[PDB]
Design a binder for these strands. Structure first.
Ligand SMILES: O=C(O)c1ccc(P(c2ccccc2)c2ccccc2)cc1
Ligand SMILES: [Au+]
Ligand SMILES: [Mg+2]
Lengths: 87, 107, 95, 14, 98, 95, 107, 82, 98
DNA sequence: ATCAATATCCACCTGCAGATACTACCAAAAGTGTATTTGGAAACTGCTCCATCAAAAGGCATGTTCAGCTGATTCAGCTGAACATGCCTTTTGATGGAGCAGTTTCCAAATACACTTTTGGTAGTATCTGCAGGTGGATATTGAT
DNA sequence: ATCAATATCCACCTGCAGATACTACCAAAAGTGTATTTGGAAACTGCTCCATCAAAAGGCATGTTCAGCTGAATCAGCTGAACATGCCTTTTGATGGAGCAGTTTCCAAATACACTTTTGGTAGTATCTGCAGGTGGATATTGAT
C-alpha cells in the first residue's frame, strides 16, 4: 500500500505568533519569551486528555473513525462542554 | 379531532418528542402526564430568553441573521444565562471585549 | 438518509414570535440545538436523582419543577416555573 | 489469588 | 520612519482579536498535532473533519480562558508581562494540578 | 426498625484480608460507605451513558470496563480492569 | 445447593446486591451477567487499595484502629487516589502538613 | 450584650482555619471578607438542602438533604450517608 | 520576661492545626448562623444533629482549601500576609464569580 | 558563646466510649423453568475521508534596535503578632413533643396494546438575499518636535 | 499645539454561499381511546431524636508595645515589542480510490420474568479493649545577653 508519512514534532506547528494571538484574545499585553514552550506543554496535556477519552469512545463503539460526537462526549466528561457539533 | 399535546398546552415545543426522550433516556420507571408539558415549556421559555437577547445583539451589530457571536454576546452579557452556561463553550462565539484597566496607557 | 431529528423547527417558531424579521445561521441553530439537549439532560438528570432520593419510580411535573429550582438561577427559575405551571394547568383543563 | 494491590501485596490465599 | 511605542500595537491586537471569532491556530499544523497524539494512542485512526474542528474550537477556547486567568495572576503580582509562573498558578488554583 | 443496608460487612472482610490485626472506627466506616456508593454511581453513570451513546439497552462487563478506563487514573485503571476481568473469568468457569 | 455469585467470582463484595442496585438505578433496561461481577470486583479492589494504605498510615501513628485521619493521609499521599477523589471531602480528615518554604524563619 | 450571628464566627476561629490552611500572617480586613465568603457558601448549600426538604414535604433538614446539596454544588462530602 | 517573636507562634499554630482534625469554629454560633440563613428559605425548620455537623465539616474544609489557594496568591505577589485581594483572586480563578 | 524560659517528646497508666462479637428473624439473593429481546454475523451500500497536487496569499522566521518593564535595593511608617487576664459565651448533660417513617389501603394515574392520523424530515429544486470582502475617501489616533 | 504617518471608519457595490421556502411525500412517531396495572397520597400512631433550658468550663474580647512586613521611590540592566525583509507552508479547490460506517434481516444466546426455596445480612443486644487523655521527667527550641 502507501503506509502513512511519519508524524514527529508537530507541537512546533503551534507557532509563537499563533500563541500571541490566543494571548491577545485573552487580553494579554506583554509576554515573556518562556511562555511559548509553557503553552505548548499545557496544550499537549489538554489534547492528550481529550483525545484519550475520544479514542476510548471510538474503540468502545468498535469504530476506526473518531467522530465529532466522540470529541463532544470527551469534552463533556472533562467539564469542557462544547456547543455547535451535535449532542 | 386530533390535537397535539403541544396545542392542548399552548406550546411551540413538542410535548410528544419530550415525553419520548424522557422514556428512552432511562431517567425513571414511569413518566407522569405533567412532566413532558412542564419540561417542554421550560425549554421553550429558555430558548425564547436566549433568542430575545441574541436578536438584540444581531440588531446592535447592524445584522438580520443571528450567528454564534450574537449568542455569545447575549449569554455572556446576562448575569443569569452566563451562570447557567458558565462551563459551556459556544463554538465560533469569541469572548467579550475586556481590557484590564492597568493595561491602558498614560496618566 | 436516516431521519436525524433536532429542535430546529421549534427554535425557528420561537425566533419568529420574538424577532419576526430576524434569521438564524445553521451554526447558530447548531448552538441552540446543543443548548436544548444540554438543559434537557441537566433537568431530566436532577429529576431522575430527586425521584431515586425519595424512593419514587415516577418523574412528575413536581420533580421537573424542583429540578428547575435547583438548576436555574433566581429569576430564570421564577419565570421558568411560571411558564411550566401555566402550560400544565392549561394542558389539564384542556380535556 | 484474591486481590492484588499496586504495592505488591495480595489478599492471603484461598 | 515613525514607530508605535511598545504596547500600542499589543492593545490594537487585543481589540482586534477580542472583536473577532476566527480560529487563531493554522488549520493544517493543528490537524497534524491531533493525528500525531491520536496515533501514539491508536494506529489506523481516521477523523471526521468536524472532530478536528471541535478539538480546535475546544483547545482555543481553553487557551484563551487560561490566558485571561494568567493575566489576572501577572497583574496580581503588579506586572503586565505573563510568565510561566502565572500559567502554573492559574492551573494550580483551577485544580488542573496539585 | 427497617433494614438500613451498607457495604460495612464487605469493607470489614477486605480490611481483614489486607490488615488482619487492624480495626476501623464508625466514622472511618461511614467514609468507606460514601466511597463505594460514589465510585458505584460514577461507574454505573458512565456505563449508562456509553450504552445510550451506542443505542444499546444493555450494560455488560464491556461498558463497566470502558467506564473504568475513563474514570480511574493510570495504574488504578490497569489493576482495576485486571481484577474485573479476573472475577468474570473465575465466575464464567464455575459450574 | 445455593452458592452466592460472589463465592463463584472469588469476591467478598456482594455481586447480588450490586446487580439489584444496577436494576433499581435506571442505568439501562437490561444488565449483562458479568457487569455486576466486574463492578463488584472493581469496588473491592479500590476498597483494598485504600484500606492497605490507610492501614499503613494507622500503623505509622502507633495505632491499630483506622480513623478518617488515616484515610485522608492514605488518599492525599497517593497521586492516583488523590486525583480520583480530588473533588471529595473526607469528614474529620484534616489536611497534610504543608508549610510553604518562604514562610520558614531565617535562622 | 447582643450581636449578629455572623460575628459569632470570631477572629480567633477564622485565624485557626487559616492556620490549618498554612497561613502565617493575616490582614485585619480578612475577618470580614471571610465572613462574606462563608455566608455565600452556606446560603448556596442551605438553599439546595431546603429545596430537597420541601420536595420531601418535610419540616426537618436531613444530613441527606445536605449531602445531596453539597454533591450538586461540587463539594461531595463522605461520612454522613449517600 | 520572655516573649516569642512575630511569626514563631503562627508557625506553631500551623504545625498544631495541620496535625489535628477537630472543627475549629464553635458549634453553637455556627448552628445559630445555619438556622438564621435557613429561616429566609422556609420558617419553622428543624435540623438533624448530623445535618448541621455535615454543613460545618463541608464549610470548614472549603475555607481551609480557600486559605491554601489564598496563601499561594499572597506568596505570588511576593508577600506572606493574606489580604482580601488574595481571597478575591483565588475565588475568581476557581470560577466562584467574576 | 551562656542561660533560662517554654515547648516538645517519650514511657507508663487506665477508665470507658466506642469498638468487636453473637444471635434469631426475614427481606432479597439464588434456583428452576418458560417468556421475550438483543446484539453480533453476513452482506451490501454510498458517504466521506485519505491522498496528492498545482498555484498563490499570507503568514512565519529572523535580525536589528531601543522603550520601558522587571526586579534589586533601600527605607520609613503602620499594621498585625504577641500577650496577661476575667467574664461572657459556649459546652455539657437532663426532659417534653414535633414530626419522621412505618404501613396498609384504594383509586387516580400510568402502562400496554394496536389501532389511525399527522408531523417533521429530507431530497430535490428553485428561489432569494444577507453580508463578506473589497475599494475609496473622509476622519481619528499616535508620537515626534 | 502642530503636523505627518498610518490606522480606522463608514458608506457603496457587488457575487454568491448559505438561507429560506416551496414542494410533494412518507415513514416513523405521535395520538386515540379502551383494557390492565399500580404507585403514591391518605390517614393513623409510635417512638426518635430534636428543641429547649439550666448548671459546668474554658475561649475570647480587650488594649498595649513594637517587630518586621508592605509598599513607595529609584535605578540600571536587558528582555521583549516593533518592524523590515525574505520566502516557506498553509490554504483552497479540484480528482479518484476505498475504507468503513451505517442498514437491514436471521436468530441462538442472552437476560427478563414469575414463582419457590434458602440464607446472608441486619438489628437488636452483649461483651471486649484501643487509646485519649493524664502524669513525670528528659531534651530541644527559642530568644535574651
Ligand atoms: O502550583 C503550585 O502549587 C504553585 C505554587 C507556587 C507557585 P509561584 C511561588 C513563588 C515564590 C515562592 C513560592 C511559590 C512560582 C513558581 C515557579 C517559579 C517562581 C514562582 C507556582 C505554582
Ligand atoms: Au507564583
Ligand atoms: Mg508517533
Amino acid at each position: 500500500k502507501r503506509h502513512r508519512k511519519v508524524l514527529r514534532d508537530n507541537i512546533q506547528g503551534i507557532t509563537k505568533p499563533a500563541i500571541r494571538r490566543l494571548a491577545r484574545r485573552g487580553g494579554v499585553k506583554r509576554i515573556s519569551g518562556l511562555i511559548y514552550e509553557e503553552t505548548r506543554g499545557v496544550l499537549k496535556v489538554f489534547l492528550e486528555n481529550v483525545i484519550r477519552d475520544a479514542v476510548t469512545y471510538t474503540e468502545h463503539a468498535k469504530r476506526k473513525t473518531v467522530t465529532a460526537m466522540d470529541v463532544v462526549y470527551a469534552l463533556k466528561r472533562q467539564g469542557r462542554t462544547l456547543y455547535g457539533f451535535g449532542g | 379531532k386530533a390535537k397535539t399535546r403541544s396545542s392542548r398546552a399552548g406550546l411551540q415545543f413538542p410535548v410528544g418528542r419530550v415525553h419520548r426522550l424522557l422514556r428512552k433516556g432511562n431517567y425513571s420507571e414511569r413518566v407522569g402526564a405533567g412532566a413532558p408539558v412542564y419540561l417542554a415549556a421550560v425549554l421553550e421559555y429558555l430558548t425564547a430568553e436566549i433568542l430575545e437577547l441574541a436578536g438584540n445583539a444581531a440588531r446592535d451589530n447592524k445584522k438580520t441573521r443571528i450567528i454564534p457571536r450574537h449568542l455569545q454576546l447575549a449569554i455572556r452579557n446576562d448575569e443569569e444565562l452566563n451562570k447557567l452556561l458558565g462551563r459551556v463553550t459556544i463554538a465560533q462565539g469569541g469572548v467579550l471585549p475586556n481590557i484590564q484597566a492597568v493595561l491602558l496607557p498614560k496618566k | 438518509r436516516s431521519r436525524k431529528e433536532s429542535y430546529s423547527v421549534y427554535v425557528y417558531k420561537v425566533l419568529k414570535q420574538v424577532h419576526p424579521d430576524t434569521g438564524i445561521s445553521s451554526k447558530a441553530m447548531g448552538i441552540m440545538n446543543s443548548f436544548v439537549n444540554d438543559i434537557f439532560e441537566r433537568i431530566a438528570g436532577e429529576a431522575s436523582r430527586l425521584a431515586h432520593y425519595n424512593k419514587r419510580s415516577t418523574i412528575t411535573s413536581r420533580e421537573i419543577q424542583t429540578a428547575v429550582r435547583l438548576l436555574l438561577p433566581g429569576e430564570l427559575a421564577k419565570h421558568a416555573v411560571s411558564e411550566g405551571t401555566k402550560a400544565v394547568t392549561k394542558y389539564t383543563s384542556a380535556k | 489469588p484474591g486481590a492484588r494491590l499496586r504495592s505488591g501485596r495480595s489478599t492471603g490465599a484461598p | 520612519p515613525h514607530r508605535y511605542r511598545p504596547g500600542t500595537v499589543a492593545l490594537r491586537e487585543i481589540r482586534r482579536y477580542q472583536k473577532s471569532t476566527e480560529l487563531l491556530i493554522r488549520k493544517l499544523p493543528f490537524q497534524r498535532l491531533v493525528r500525531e497524539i491520536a496515533q501514539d494512542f491508536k494506529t489506523d485512526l481516521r477523523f471526521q473533519s468536524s472532530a478536528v474542528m471541535a478539538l480546535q474550537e475546544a483547545c482555543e477556547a481553553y487557551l484563551v480562558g487560561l490566558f485571561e486567568d494568567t493575566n489576572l495572576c501577572a497583574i496580581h503580582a503588579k506586572r503586565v508581562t505573563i510568565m510561566p509562573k502565572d500559567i502554573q498558578l492559574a492551573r494550580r488554583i483551577r485544580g488542573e494540578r496539585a
